[PDB]
């Protein structure tokens, strides 16, 4: 099946995350800009032109994080002890209900890894857009879960927590604003 960039998914993600659509698009390109510039869409770097553009790898790391931690939520029962981010979530469910997460939660990776590699080589410009679109597509696929009733609340909290964690960490690579340099306990600070 052919593929084409569906820009509608990005805007829908922006509203649910109450952040500007340019913040979604600028994932992997926050370096060299302040956070205020990110949301304004100011100084957006041109779309990648080569397969060796670090932005393509940067966005793919974000998509991997979502899939990596989602599988932790998918397979909480398999862990000897679940990770902290998912411990907060499924702390109130039983072991039998924990084992139910594996079957109930749909498999969302599909063929991202195989699709990304071909696109990263053939079309570096579209590789960035596909990865961002896929990150947003999976988010609404998680967020639009409707049944069973218990899994709606668990998944909805995780999906909001994950991308905001992704965005915040992505935001943390942007330019730093004014702050008190004394927070590092020494006499000097360098660059």
């Amino acid at each position: 099946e052919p593929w084409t960039f569906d820009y509608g998914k990005i805007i829908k993600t922006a509203k649910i995350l109450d952040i500007s659509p340019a913040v979604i698009e600028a994932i992997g390109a926050m370096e060299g800009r302040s956070y205020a510039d990110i949301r304004e869409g100011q100084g957006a770097p041109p779309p990648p032109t080569s397969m060796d553009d670090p932005r393509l790898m940067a966005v793919d790391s974000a998509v991997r994080i979502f899939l990596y931690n989602y599988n932790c939520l998918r397979h909480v029962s398999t862990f000897n002890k679940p990770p902290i981010h998912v411990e907060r979530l499924v702390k109130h469910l039983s072991y039998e209900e924990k084992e139910d997460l594996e079957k109930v939660l749909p498999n969302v990776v599909n063929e991202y890894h195989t699709t990304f590699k071909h696109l990263r080589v053939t079309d570096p410009a579209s590789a960035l857009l596909y990865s961002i679109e896929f990150l947003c597509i999976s988010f609404l696929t998680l967020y639009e879960i409707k049944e069973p009733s218990w899994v709606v609340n668990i998944v909805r909290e995780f999906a909001l927590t994950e991308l905001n964690t992704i965005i915040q960490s992505e935001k943390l690579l942007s330019k730093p604003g004014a702050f008190n340099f004394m927070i590092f306990g020494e006499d000097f600070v360098c660059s």
Partner: protein, 149 residues
């Protein structure tokens, strides 16, 4: 294990696992790292088999020092950990974390440092980081070829 140590102005006698340096620049997928080293995961050969198995062994080795960020797939967390470990003048490891702008300053400074210190002949700009990863994989491939006698 296959540890990569960078000795320059800002770094000294600090040994980093190779996959950590690779996934510091994105590309956190192990498939991509193994492809960068052995250049192909789909042509079997006898050389690629050995390199693949030993890179697996290196990936799964637990080092004592970089334990918190060894299994982490989050680029920002690893960049922070290395900046905390390698940058001087930061004595408080917990006080600075509660300030977002201090975190951002450390991350940006560390990224600039790694841009200027890791294979500078390959480039000194952030857009040349993936080709730096390719070159580092080539170096690891050459060393592992030499191991085969």
């Amino acid at each position: 294990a296959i540890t990569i140590e960078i000795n320059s102005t800002k770094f000294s006698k600090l040994r980093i696992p190779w996959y950590l340096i690779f996934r510091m620049f994105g590309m956190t997928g192990d498939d991509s790292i193994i492809e960068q080293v052995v250049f192909d995961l789909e042509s079997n050969s006898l050389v690629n088999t050995f390199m693949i198995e030993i890179l697996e062994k290196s990936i799964h080795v637990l080092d004592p020092i970089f334990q918190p960020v060894q299994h982490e797939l989050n680029r920002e967390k690893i960049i922070q950990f290395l900046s905390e470990k390698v940058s001087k003048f930061v004595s408080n490891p917990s006080a600075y974390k509660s300030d977002e702008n201090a975190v951002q300053y450390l991350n940006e400074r560390q990224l600039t440092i790694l841009d200027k210190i890791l294979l500078p002949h390959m480039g000194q700009t952030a857009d040349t980081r993936v080709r730096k990863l390719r070159f580092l994989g080539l170096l690891i491939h050459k060393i592992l070829l030499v191991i085969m006698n």
